[PDB]
Design a binder for this molecule. Structure first.
Ligand SMILES: COCC(=O)Nc1c(C)cc(C)cc1C
Ligand SMILES: COCC(=O)Nc1c(C)cc(C)cc1C
Ligand SMILES: [Ca+2]
Ligand SMILES: [Ca+2]
Lengths: 204, 204
């Protein structure tokens, strides 16, 4: 009876791991395609499945971080959303923290996405007339040429500055979609998606 | 591109169907075992997965009704919970509506569970001192010997009546657990649980 219950709990953990990978793939695809409602509904399913998982492998933790990162990026302009216990941290600042924690290569694309999130974390505050909040985000992030140009823009209250058009919110999303395309290629061969694709193809 | 997107959406629907069956099995098992927190977390996952499913087969609708029925039964004493658009309907009355909609055999066990939910829908109101609400639940449900004994109990305000001890909340739960054991046997061979069990056994 206890041995049966134990084997059942272990099978539930295996199935939850398969569901996590499938939901991550689905969330990546909705983000890449710009399918906002599908992204919201998939995010809800991913959060619930994660609360039913206890011990995680390093691979499963990386998968959860990717889901959390995309969720904060999708909420990047929602300055009312609180993703951290410290209520001062904005959504893009929370995405930056996760981006620096993921066990992944720090290639040129990694640093380009990092620097675009830093610029946009300030830009989104400026565009909402939150000038003092922009200076506070700047202080939490930045602690030289890059840094001093941003402080000058904040002090002038230059919301529609040409600098934010060169390193725009759209450019940040496009670079992040390039990374998401690599995660999609990597996770497309996971168990639940492979098995479902084989079923669909067998009916063609 | 559109054909690829279509094949991907069809594979997501297949995987969601597999996840629905697995979560139903998991919810049944937590209900049978009395694992309250596991039941709550599994219910959350089942609700989210159901919102991402559109067209349902008759089998998938029956699976969703079983999940909804157990959720209302687990909330049977939570008179503040609103499961229907009509706010007057209590949780056990909502479970009774689903029990009468499921495409299942109307064997002796079916009618015994039906009559136990009817008695307890009134009993739970009486035990909370909600005497007028007990009469209103009685009117919605009952429209002769069974019916007249219940109306007499409501009018006397006989909360701890011996009748409610003979056909008790515990007796209703035990009969429902007998039914849940049949659903567990039927769904134990579904895809995701079979595959996860095979993985666990291969590591023994
Ligand atoms: C607020 O911190 C917890 C958190 O980020 N939760 C969360 C997880 C785990 C997964 C997804 C897909 C989305 C969210 C919001
Ligand atoms: C309130 O009506 C909708 C409803 O019952 N939703 C629901 C579903 C679909 C599945 C589960 C397991 C639980 C609930 C509460
Ligand atoms: Ca805010
Ligand atoms: Ca109420």
């Amino acid at each position: 009876e206890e041995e049966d219950a134990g084997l059942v709990a272990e099978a539930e953990a295996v199935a939850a791991g398969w569901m996590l990978d499938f939901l991550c793939l689905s969330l990546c695809r909705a983000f890449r395609d710009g399918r906002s409602e599908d992204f919201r509904r998939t995010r809800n399913s991913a959060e619930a499945i994660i609360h039913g998982l206890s011990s995680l492998t390093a691979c499963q933790l990386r998968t959860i971080y990717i889901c959390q990162f995309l969720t904060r990026i999708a909420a990047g302009k929602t300055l009312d959303a609180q993703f951290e216990n410290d209520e001062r941290i904005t959504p893009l600042e929370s995405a930056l923290m996760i981006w620096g924690s993921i066990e992944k290569e720090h290639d040129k694309l990694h640093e380009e996405i990092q620097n675009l999130i830093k610029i946009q974390a300030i830009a989104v505050c400026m565009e909402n007339g939150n000038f003092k909040e922009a200076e506070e985000v700047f202080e939490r992030i930045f602690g030289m040429p890059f840094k001093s140009k941003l402080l000058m823009i904040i002090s002038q209250k230059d919301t529609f500055h040409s600098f934010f058009q060169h390193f725009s919110y759209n450019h940040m999303m496009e670079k992040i979609k390039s990374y998401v395309n690599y995660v999609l290629s990597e996770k497309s061969s996971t168990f639940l998606m492979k098995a479902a694709a084989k079923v669909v193809e067998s009916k063609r």
